[PDB]
Assembly symmetry: C2
Homo-oligomer: 76 residues x 2
């Protein structure tokens, strides 16, 4: 329900950017990016206790679909 | 196109490695990692045509939950 503000947003978006930098440094393809990122995500989720391990990945995948569909929400 | 993969698995792993190096040098938490990676993936899927955008994100998310449940032990 509430989006936790545990960390500085600047830092959050910066890390996102630095990750994108890696992807643009190699000029990776969409397929490649998804495959590399997917393994990175899974690695982190494996470090999360099993009790919530299935929950965190599901919420991840759920929210992922939410953000993708909101790109043409009220734009052309 | 005469492409079955194009990119070498060696490079694929190396990219994942570098992505990990990014996350490690930032000392990211599970919360932060998923939050940053989610936006990164979303931007990648935003480069994918809407004609297949829902397909790629669904297979991505599908493969994620597969990997999470599959990867308890290494594999071999």
């Amino acid at each position: 329900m509430p989006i936790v503000s545990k960390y500085s947003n600047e830092r959050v978006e910066k890390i996102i950017q630095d990750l994108l930098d890696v992807l643009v440094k190699e000029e990776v393809t969409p397929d490649l990016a998804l495959m590399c990122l997917g393994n990175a995500v899974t690695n982190i989720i494996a470090q999360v206790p099993e009790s919530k391990r299935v929950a965190v990945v599901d919420n991840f995948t759920k929210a992922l679909k939410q953000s993708v569909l909101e790109h043409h929400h009220h734009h052309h």
